[PDB]
Design a protein around this ligand. Structure first.
Ligand SMILES: [Cl-]
Ligand SMILES: [Cl-]
Length: 162
């Protein structure tokens, strides 16, 4: 188990444009294309990202290539963030994977509003942090994913994903 396999389970894999859980156009392994309601807008975004006229469809290989860039960006986004970096650096490998999961799904921004949970994380008060993470739109909207990520932080194991 690792970050790749971990996200691949949370996000699934789809080769045509689809709407995510928030109703936004996505493709591949959770690669958000655009927040706009326009499909054309999405298809343009798509062609720009892939580098060709896709017509809303891509190959597995292209999916994977977006996914790689996106995991990388997530990481680096974290390392570049003054509030997150230190939290992340205080943690072990599993728990780091969980934070990158969050950052991947909700962006640097979304994750940055878990200030309180992060402070607990940094203090290593796991069960408390787990409780606090649950009090969130995030948990209320995608509860099963949320629970998985939360178990991961609380336990420091991959149990929720095995
Ligand atoms: Cl891109
Ligand atoms: Cl869910």
């Amino acid at each position: 188990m690792n970050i790749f396999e971990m996200l691949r389970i949370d996000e699934g894999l789809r080769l045509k444009i689809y709407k995510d859980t928030e109703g936004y156009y996505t493709i591949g392994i959770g690669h958000l294309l655009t927040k706009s309601p326009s499909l054309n807008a999405a298809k343009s975004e798509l062609d720009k990202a892939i580098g060709r006229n896709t017509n809303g469809v891509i190959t597995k290989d292209e999916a994977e290539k977006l996914f790689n860039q996106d995991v990388d960006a997530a990481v680096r986004g974290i390392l570049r963030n003054a509030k997150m970096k230190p939290v992340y650096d205080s943690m072990d490998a599993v728990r780091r994977a969980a934070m990158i999961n969050m950052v991947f799904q909700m962006g640097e921004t979304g994750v940055a509003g878990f200030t309180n949970s992060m402070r607990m994380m940094q203090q290593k008060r796991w069960d408390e942090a787990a409780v606090n993470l649950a009090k969130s739109r995030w948990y209320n909207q995608t509860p099963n994913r949320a629970k998985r990520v939360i178990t991961t932080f609380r336990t420091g194991t991959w149990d929720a994903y095995k």
